[PDB]
Amino acid sequence: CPLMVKVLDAVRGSPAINVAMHVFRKAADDTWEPFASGKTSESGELHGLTTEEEFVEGIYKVEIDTKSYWKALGISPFHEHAEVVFTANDSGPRRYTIAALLSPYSYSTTAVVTNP
Template sequence: MIKVLDAVRGIPAAKLSIKVYKQKEDKSWELLSTRVTAEDGEVHDLVKEEDFVEGVYKLELGTKRFWSKVGISPFHEYVDVVFPANDAGHRHYTIAVLLTPYSFSTTALVSEPIETHT
């Protein structure tokens, strides 16, 4: 899951485009999915569980278009968050991003998946 907050207006960053890429062996990037944040600034299920295997991933946030929609001219065309995943077995990732037109900050919570019993 990813959660994005607009630090200028103090609200969730709704309708922000996010692309998910996986790095291939030749170091190029393969696009896995494109999503848009909901009104709460969140996107769940960015990648299908079976496709989220060990590797390096990149989240590309379409920040220029996001800020332009509210009349702000940003410094960044987009923001990339690049991270290794599942190198120690399958994990659940929650990534939080705090955005302004001229800066960004990220943090991650990496945890064991929660099994549900039906």
């Protein structure tokens, strides 16, 4: 897929499984419109969010529901969610892997961008 998200748990040393996330795309009127959503698999990965045809140029936001994840494990975390906002496909189609590493009071996010 042109967009994949991978989430890891830094407390348990495991993929972060069943983590919900919503993707939005910024509309011409500057509002965030729903684009795609899903949950991470047993591998901590979410594939198949979109297609090369649908994933046009624009500004996208991935909101990862990290708070529900920690809560279900008995932990009250700091962040409401982890947010990743980026311009996609500005110079033609790319594949994007967004990786998030989660701790209760901290998170890291990185992007790997490759040319098809």
